[PDB]
Design a protein around this ligand. Structure first.
Ligand SMILES: CC(C)C[C@@H](NS(=O)(=O)c1ccc(-c2ccccc2)cc1)C(=O)O
Ligand SMILES: [Ca+2]
Ligand SMILES: [Ca+2]
Ligand SMILES: [Ca+2]
Ligand SMILES: [Zn+2]
Ligand SMILES: [Zn+2]
Length: 158
């Protein structure tokens, strides 16, 4: 599948969930990109204007693509693989309740998984991997990529 053919990648947060403090949204997404730059040659930068490689969106229901959201629960988020336009973009379901913690849905952990998709990673069958296809909460202050995640991303970059 496609991969980014460049080392400097930009992102942009299109809008903010009302579920969280703004600076906490900024930090969760930043930390989530950091998980992947930790183990690859990629560098991620947040821009506040113009076109970014990865647009970060909060939206509910039908939101202008072919991956409608489904209300609270079920699908939490989705992301497009590397490429032009909507490629790379990561959408988060506003009908979920995003948090910094174990309540509602953890935005950081979700974003790590979704940014894996934005970078061109598929799913792992290992329940310990962040790329396992089903959301499972782990403590975020001690989060670490599984060895399966690392081999997956390192198969694509670096
Ligand atoms: C359009 C969707 C069907 C695909 C999407 N779905 S998801 O919201 O169910 C999702 C989100 C996060 C995870 C996840 C798994 C492990 C750790 C952290 C997040 C898994 C599934 C996904 O796999 O990213
Ligand atoms: Ca949902
Ligand atoms: Ca894009
Ligand atoms: Ca919400
Ligand atoms: Zn979408
Ligand atoms: Zn997934």
């Amino acid at each position: 599948g496609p991969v980014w053919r460049k080392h400097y990648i930009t992102y942009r947060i299109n809008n903010y969930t009302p579920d969280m403090n703004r600076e906490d949204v900024d930090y969760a997404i930043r930390k989530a990109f950091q998980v992947w730059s930790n183990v690859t040659p990629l560098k991620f930068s947040k821009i506040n204007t113009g076109m970014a490689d990865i647009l970060v969106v909060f939206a509910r229901g039908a939101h202008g693509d072919d991956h409608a959201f489904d209300g609270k629960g079920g699908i939490l988020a989705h992301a497009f693989g590397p490429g032009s336009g909507i490629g790379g973009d990561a959408h988060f379901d506003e009908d979920e309740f995003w948090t910094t913690h174990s309540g509602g849905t953890n935005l950081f952990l979700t974003a790590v998984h979704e940014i894996g998709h934005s970078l061109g990673l598929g799913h792992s069958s290992d329940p310990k991997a962040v790329m396992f296809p089903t959301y499972k909460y782990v403590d975020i202050n001690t989060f670490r990529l599984s060895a399966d995640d690392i081999r997956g991303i390192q198969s694509l970059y670096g």
